[PDB]
Design an enzyme around this catalytic site. Sequence first.
Site, PDB file in Angstrom:
ATOM      1  N   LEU A  64      35.945  59.747  30.646  1.00  0.00           N
ATOM      2  CA  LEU A  64      35.057  59.099  29.711  1.00  0.00           C
ATOM      3  C   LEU A  64      34.787  59.933  28.497  1.00  0.00           C
ATOM      4  O   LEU A  64      34.659  59.389  27.393  1.00  0.00           O
ATOM      5  CB  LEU A  64      33.731  58.785  30.384  1.00  0.00           C
ATOM      6  N   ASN A 117      31.212  36.004  23.382  1.00  0.00           N
ATOM      7  CA  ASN A 117      31.321  34.963  24.388  1.00  0.00           C
ATOM      8  C   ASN A 117      32.085  33.734  23.882  1.00  0.00           C
ATOM      9  O   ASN A 117      32.745  33.069  24.686  1.00  0.00           O
ATOM     10  CB  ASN A 117      29.924  34.578  24.848  1.00  0.00           C
ATOM     11  N   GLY A 157      15.594  40.850  22.733  1.00  0.00           N
ATOM     12  CA  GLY A 157      14.445  41.705  22.630  1.00  0.00           C
ATOM     13  C   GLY A 157      14.582  42.977  23.430  1.00  0.00           C
ATOM     14  O   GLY A 157      14.324  44.080  22.934  1.00  0.00           O
ATOM     15  N   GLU A 209      36.848  62.026  27.376  1.00  0.00           N
ATOM     16  CA  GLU A 209      38.131  61.924  26.739  1.00  0.00           C
ATOM     17  C   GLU A 209      38.183  60.626  25.990  1.00  0.00           C
ATOM     18  O   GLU A 209      38.713  60.589  24.880  1.00  0.00           O
ATOM     19  CB  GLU A 209      39.213  62.049  27.785  1.00  0.00           C
ATOM     20  N   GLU A 251      10.865  41.346  32.352  1.00  0.00           N
ATOM     21  CA  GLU A 251      10.466  40.143  33.012  1.00  0.00           C
ATOM     22  C   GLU A 251      10.955  40.214  34.406  1.00  0.00           C
ATOM     23  O   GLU A 251      12.150  40.392  34.636  1.00  0.00           O
ATOM     24  CB  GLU A 251      11.064  38.913  32.352  1.00  0.00           C
TER      25      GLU A 251
HETATM   26  N1  LIG Z   1      28.380  37.583  28.342  1.00  0.00           N
HETATM   27  C1  LIG Z   1      27.131  37.279  28.553  1.00  0.00           C
HETATM   28  N2  LIG Z   1      26.306  37.059  27.530  1.00  0.00           N
HETATM   29  C2  LIG Z   1      25.028  36.750  27.926  1.00  0.00           C
HETATM   30  C3  LIG Z   1      24.540  36.641  29.232  1.00  0.00           C
HETATM   31  N3  LIG Z   1      23.208  36.308  29.238  1.00  0.00           N
HETATM   32  C4  LIG Z   1      22.893  36.208  27.974  1.00  0.00           C
HETATM   33  N4  LIG Z   1      23.942  36.470  27.126  1.00  0.00           N
HETATM   34  C5  LIG Z   1      23.919  36.443  25.654  1.00  0.00           C
HETATM   35  O1  LIG Z   1      22.969  37.426  25.206  1.00  0.00           O
HETATM   36  C6  LIG Z   1      22.008  36.805  24.314  1.00  0.00           C
HETATM   37  C7  LIG Z   1      20.768  36.428  25.057  1.00  0.00           C
HETATM   38  O2  LIG Z   1      19.768  37.426  25.148  1.00  0.00           O
HETATM   39  P1  LIG Z   1      18.435  36.924  25.974  1.00  0.00           P
HETATM   40  O3  LIG Z   1      18.785  36.533  27.352  1.00  0.00           O
HETATM   41  O4  LIG Z   1      17.796  35.865  25.141  1.00  0.00           O
HETATM   42  O5  LIG Z   1      17.524  38.148  25.943  1.00  0.00           O
HETATM   43  P2  LIG Z   1      17.531  39.535  26.581  1.00  0.00           P
HETATM   44  O6  LIG Z   1      18.420  40.346  25.649  1.00  0.00           O
HETATM   45  O7  LIG Z   1      17.854  39.511  28.002  1.00  0.00           O
HETATM   46  O8  LIG Z   1      16.007  40.113  26.342  1.00  0.00           O
HETATM   47  P3  LIG Z   1      14.668  39.213  25.957  1.00  0.00           P
HETATM   48  O9  LIG Z   1      14.817  38.543  24.598  1.00  0.00           O
HETATM   49  O10 LIG Z   1      13.388  40.048  25.818  1.00  0.00           O
HETATM   50  O11 LIG Z   1      14.584  38.210  27.089  1.00  0.00           O
HETATM   51  C8  LIG Z   1      22.668  35.540  23.814  1.00  0.00           C
HETATM   52  O12 LIG Z   1      23.450  35.826  22.677  1.00  0.00           O
HETATM   53  C9  LIG Z   1      23.488  35.112  25.020  1.00  0.00           C
HETATM   54  O13 LIG Z   1      24.602  34.330  24.586  1.00  0.00           O
HETATM   55  C10 LIG Z   1      25.422  36.866  30.288  1.00  0.00           C
HETATM   56  O14 LIG Z   1      25.152  36.821  31.488  1.00  0.00           O
HETATM   57  N5  LIG Z   1      26.729  37.194  29.867  1.00  0.00           N
END
Ligand SMILES: Nc1nc2c(ncn2[C@@H]2O[C@H](COP(=O)(O)OP(=O)(O)OP(=O)(O)O)[C@@H](O)[C@H]2O)c(=O)[nH]1
Lengths: 426, 426, 428, 428
Positions: free
Chosen positions: D241, D195, D133, D243, D60
Amino acid sequence: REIVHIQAGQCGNQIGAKFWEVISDEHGIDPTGSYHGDSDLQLERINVYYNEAAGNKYVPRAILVDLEPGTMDSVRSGPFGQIFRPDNFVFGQSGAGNNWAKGHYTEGAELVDSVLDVVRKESESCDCLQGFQLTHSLGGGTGSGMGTLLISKIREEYPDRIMNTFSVVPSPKVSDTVVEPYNATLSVHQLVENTDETYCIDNEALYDICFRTLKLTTPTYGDLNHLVSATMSGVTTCLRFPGQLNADLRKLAVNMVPFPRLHFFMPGFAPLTSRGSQQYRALTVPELTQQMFDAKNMMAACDPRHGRYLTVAAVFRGRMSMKEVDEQMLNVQNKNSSYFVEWIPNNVKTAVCDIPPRGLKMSATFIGNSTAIQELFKRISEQFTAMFRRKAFLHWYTGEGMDEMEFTEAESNMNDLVSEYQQYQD
Amino acid sequence: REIVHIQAGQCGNQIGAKFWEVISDEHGIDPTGSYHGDSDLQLERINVYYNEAAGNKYVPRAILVDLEPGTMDSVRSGPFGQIFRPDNFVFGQSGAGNNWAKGHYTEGAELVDSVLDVVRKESESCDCLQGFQLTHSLGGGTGSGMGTLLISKIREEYPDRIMNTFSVVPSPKVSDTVVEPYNATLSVHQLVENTDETYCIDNEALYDICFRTLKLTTPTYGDLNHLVSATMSGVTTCLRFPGQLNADLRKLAVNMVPFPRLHFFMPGFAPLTSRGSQQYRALTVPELTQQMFDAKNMMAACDPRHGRYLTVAAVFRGRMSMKEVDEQMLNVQNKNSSYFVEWIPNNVKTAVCDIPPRGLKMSATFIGNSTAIQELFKRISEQFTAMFRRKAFLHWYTGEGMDEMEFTEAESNMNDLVSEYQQYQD
Amino acid sequence: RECISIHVGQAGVQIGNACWELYCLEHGIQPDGQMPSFNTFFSETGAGKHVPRAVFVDLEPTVIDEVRTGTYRQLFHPEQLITGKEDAANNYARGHYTIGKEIIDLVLDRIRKLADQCTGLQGFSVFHSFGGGTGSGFTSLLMERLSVDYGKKSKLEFSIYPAPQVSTAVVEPYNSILTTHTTLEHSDCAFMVDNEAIYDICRRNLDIERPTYTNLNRLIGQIVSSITASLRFDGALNVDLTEFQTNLVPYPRGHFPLATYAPVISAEKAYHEQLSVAEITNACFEPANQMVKCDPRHGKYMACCLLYRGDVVPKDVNAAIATIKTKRTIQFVDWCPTGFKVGINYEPPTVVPGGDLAKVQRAVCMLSNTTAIAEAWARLDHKFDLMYAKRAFVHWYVGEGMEEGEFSEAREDMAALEKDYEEVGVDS
Amino acid sequence: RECISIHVGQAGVQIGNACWELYCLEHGIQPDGQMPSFNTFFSETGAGKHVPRAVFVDLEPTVIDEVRTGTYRQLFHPEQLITGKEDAANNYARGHYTIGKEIIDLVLDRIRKLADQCTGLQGFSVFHSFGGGTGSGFTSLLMERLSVDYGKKSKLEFSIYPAPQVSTAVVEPYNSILTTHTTLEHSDCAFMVDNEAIYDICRRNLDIERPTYTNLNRLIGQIVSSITASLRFDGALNVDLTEFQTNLVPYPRGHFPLATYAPVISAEKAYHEQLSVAEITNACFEPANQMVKCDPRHGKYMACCLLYRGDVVPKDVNAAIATIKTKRTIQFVDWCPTGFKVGINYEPPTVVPGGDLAKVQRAVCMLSNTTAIAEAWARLDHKFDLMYAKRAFVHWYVGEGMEEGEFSEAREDMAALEKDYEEVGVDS
Ligand SMILES: Nc1nc2c(ncn2[C@@H]2O[C@H](COP(=O)(O)OP(=O)(O)OP(=O)(O)O)[C@@H](O)[C@H]2O)c(=O)[nH]1
Ligand SMILES: Nc1nc2c(ncn2[C@@H]2O[C@H](COP(=O)(O)OP(=O)(O)OP(=O)(O)O)[C@@H](O)[C@H]2O)c(=O)[nH]1
Ligand SMILES: Nc1nc2c(ncn2[C@@H]2O[C@H](COP(=O)(O)OP(=O)(O)O)[C@@H](O)[C@H]2O)c(=O)[nH]1
Ligand SMILES: Nc1nc2c(ncn2[C@@H]2O[C@H](COP(=O)(O)OP(=O)(O)O)[C@@H](O)[C@H]2O)c(=O)[nH]1
Ligand SMILES: [Mg+2]
Ligand SMILES: [Mg+2]
């Protein structure tokens, strides 16, 4: 990446009148067509809904359809009716009269070919369509009747695009057409299996919200359709604008549909309260979640705590912490565990956009798929049966060739959706 | 840590009108809702009674309930009626008419569901409730009737929160409703076992104080309810503000209740004298203790030296020595040993707050639980019996379905409280 | 060589406020921790800031907030300042059980963190009050855990002795009786003072008829500093805290040494009067300076410890002892010879700027275990009994899960304690 | 001596944004690439601009556009910024197959181009999330190709561990189960963080009740920099790395070391407190600083690696190790002796200007493989099961060509993995 929208029926045309207004608000596009904004984002993803025509003119990617020029004219006469090109006004002459048979089966069918041709012209104008959206009433002649016909052909042409629709669902108290449940029944029969998803809007519920929480004593349909457009616009902007979570409509559809046939939605919206209290409100994530969960802030005349929740989507607009959102959604899941379905672990899903709706600091859109939805179907089916036995106005429909066995199957199909909700209600 | 307050009945609504006024005085909160104080403490513990709404607006955590819009309107029309949000005004239409049956048993019962819903919304808005407080009249229809109903449901929802109430007790001379003792009897029957504690306020006694020591010849209910609010506000501020002793409401309740059923209180207040003498008064701890012990400074038409004292709480506001307080309380115990109950060693307990009430250097609140209280019950019970035999106005009550055997049990229960006071009077 | 102070409840914390203020006064510690100069109590940062090794517990935000908004808010580490939201309500049932038991784990982990910061934990001491909810309730809860983890460390408790005449807590007897039951068995030594007796000291020796707790706690702080700051500082006879325990606790029950402190003198009273070591110690055996309202002449002595500050020469001390042993009416229990611990620090006595006590050049603190303490228990016995016989206020404990048998039991444990005092009184 | 970072998905890219920002902070790299001064990660131009050797993938446009419009848009080469038009929709079926499989060839060719720019490719690491995804779908697709072409290079993955309580993706169990199946078998090591656990760290150690992802990723960046910047910089024990892989992966299955990081301290918490190496490592074995919500005390340890920044003396480390080996309750699996990798860099810990963490003079990162991870799988097992039993949302995968048997299979592979943990838990 782009979306095409088609409006139909007096309802659909008037809803769209507000929808497009809002979209242009979002991007700073003037009622006459040019862009006079002021944010990079405003133009950046404009493509999903606008074609930029020579001269920095933006053309809304939508078709306005009706069978009476006068409604179309009234739309055209206001601001933003000038932004639509004449080629997007496709209409005939002589109503439908709120008759499915005319709309779908016979006369309106005739117009659909010209509509579709324009649709094709726009599908070519897009680089890559994400999908299509249609606005209409379930109990109306062109809204549902002709609209449905169109949908079946668009889906045929584009199996791989999102097909959704928002529709006004006959409220228990205010039906206009005597056979409004008949038209609705027929539209279920056709729509459900020819759409990816449909949203259930009840005007009665909307009128309650506008007085219940918004404390307003003068709304019109334009004010209620504003609320409708808030939910519609809420969904697509995120897809358009930068966020944190996962901002794709198809992904939303994937997360909200556990079963091929049960794709009906209950929209809700937060914050959504009168100005008096705005001096006494705090703006937090739990605040939005309180408004989102509360059934009274639903736009559908259902009661999610009566049924079971299959899926929940919480879309957020504006800067929020991830933590807070995660925790509050968890809390919701925890405290309302008695309504959620046990088959789906962590049934509440989120989406986060960092752009707030103009004028607000934050906002949230509630999308749900409960079993409670079946109650609407039950009301219609019952009313239908009574009419079915008497053939009320069916001479108008059978006069235009609609056969009673087709209606019989439609009745079954309504009952099938209810039984499947029961099958997953458990 | 937080408290929710609910006012009901014309009495309760007008008392609360002064109560909240005072609380905002204490914290420097303007009649329009914003904070314009000037002390750190003023905002620091504001949470117990206010929600800060966006814009630095403070919302009093209370519900105003009635069955006549006009009283509510009059409350709303004054300063501090603007600080309450519209959502805290819950009312119906057509009175109660000072009828328990209507209030509790039938019609008012209908409203209670909407009240409780708002209560729930506020219980969620709090982080952690300490308890609830209600203001009402014992002989009134909505005050006691509907109010009691509400209490039974709140207690049910929150067994672990403090449930107390302050109530106007029918004065020997001025009853308004012919069956005021009936309503009171029924409220005892319901309240006593559905509350943690109740305070006994006699208007007659209040009118004596205002002329007796305050030497005033024009008071209204607003002036007398000022005195009421002085005691109410006295209690909770300490809990709110830094002190020396033990500043928790629950702990107060624990220290004042020796027996599950005998939780009735006699409030009193010091200093409380006319301006003339203010030039001839000295401000010492013994001075406050003299005013506190003196029965004429009680707000209840009782006589503590007639009965026996079970428990005494002395709450002090302002800078005092610990020594002096300890010694004077001891002296009181010593000199009035003939009134105290021998089962409780050192029956006089203290609480100390270092914040004085605005405008005074020091102040003290007297809370007592004597056996003398039973005399009020005796007066009511007797009057009740006479009416009971005649069924005065009971056709109104039985017409709304109230059964005489329920009343019979209520009578017993009154007599039971008296016998239990006798059981511990010794 | 390190120790931990624990401040539970208002009484514990407000006394602590005075205590840490005094320690700052002892070394010139700035409110921000900057000290230009006692690491037995303090932990050093690279900025030269020192952190007092102590834990502050309050289940009501207010008192800790008072700390947090005062000058010493910069001194204390935010993790040392632990607060709950709700109170015990004067009630062991919530303090020890229902409420305090929820937060205690946090509290313990902060303690353990500090225990890990200690390199040679000598021990600790707990400041509280015998009547309150957290003051005694929570306190004993803590002891229940600390005696497991730190079983071999000093477990000294300091508590306010409930005034016989004034008490603000109607169920204080009940609270204190329950604490007896649970503290006797866990703690090593508990010290106590009577605010009423102190008032008499303030009005007679300081000439003050307006004492507040902020005065009262300064005096307590004096006593505490003598045994905390000056025992870590240099002297002739440097006595440790473990040594205190080893020299003050004679039996495995508890024991409860009471405080006495002389000099307590107003500035004007210091003028025109010359105190010697011997004269100060004479004052120490006078009922008049007894910090608990209990008559020293009533009971018999079992233990006695004298701790000296400033200008004290052992030579004079020896003479003083000779006279207190032989001149006084101090009856003592057979069991004991007069081995009274003498701690002699060169470290001078200190005075709080703006305080009531006069600058003194020498000072003596006295700890003593007398049989008259049983009368204090007798006071509690009847107060408890009265309430318990009527069962007044009982529902405030029962509703939290307390048992009536338990309360009887606790009284009986007190009775047993009184009986053991009786035993000691019988000479043998 | 070179390596490649790969950022897939929002999570991968936004974390990457923090990571590359930190690398710029490490050397003073200007947004335009101008560096006045680490060529293991960067490729140099004749202008003295350095290009971070990394690939950014998003299907995207938006997130990459966020990069393209930010300050670091000048830093990144336009070819590094790869974007598609449409999403995976939270769905492996599109991410790995239908959609992502179309663009991957481009992506791979950019990777290969960089591999050709490398002279001594040590390896690479992939940043993503277990539920998304592209985050997991596309990611595994990539591994399928990278493990062929770069079979002998480091294949380290870093992924966000799905929070047990909050997840925005209803079919995340399904996604993660499919990834297990395909990543276990291809990757060398996968690390993960929660998180939710991080929020607890932010609120308890940083004292922040408003964490956003832009905070959360700074903390992640810290951990990553310790193992990426500082492992290429000078130290006593310079650990590579490869290592890392050679010292962290004990079995040919995967393994999943979890991150723990101490110091995580707010500026005010740093004041008044002196950390030593040993004290920091004490914190590292506390559940409280565990970056994944999984109880360290539940399982047994298999691997543990401690990596040190700044003022660390091996002398102190040795003592610290002795105590963690013997003092703690850390149970460990028989198989393993306690050979814990100690990396000791002289390179000081760095802090993000305007960040939440305090400037520290020394820091320790901990990686650990504990048997408690099976419980994490158990969580997934039931979540998957529930959905799969009802067949909720199944049509969103089936319509893309997924097979139900496949899903069962993937679950079974997870079950097998859990069983192998069971096996390891059995001591032998
Ligand atoms: N630590 C952290 N976790 C994140 C961040 N953005 C998203 N997440 C976590 O990663 C997951 C979200 O994945 P999405 O943003 O929905 O999707 P994507 O993996 O980018 O790919 P698509 O589904 O195709 O959009 C959730 O479990 C969020 O809590 C971020 O900036 N930092
Ligand atoms: N010397 C001294 N005694 C105090 C002080 N504050 C309170 N006390 C005494 O300690 C007892 C009061 O305990 P409270 O303040 O009621 O309660 P608490 O022990 O702090 O705990 P809670 O009951 O839960 O609030 C009384 O006997 C007071 O006389 C103080 O600052 N100094
Ligand atoms: N919310 C909403 N409902 C509308 C509007 N116009 C008609 N409706 C609803 O649509 C139904 C009538 O169908 P209608 O739109 O007249 O059908 P058609 O025009 O023949 O396609 C009734 O249930 C109305 O409440 C509108 O502008 N907003
Ligand atoms: N102190 C006090 N008593 C009041 C006020 N208003 C009514 N009362 C008393 O309340 C009793 C009458 O009940 P009322 O409040 O009219 O009942 P309700 O309004 O039907 O619930 C009488 O004993 C009055 O003296 C008031 O503002 N202050
Ligand atoms: Mg994405
Ligand atoms: Mg307290």
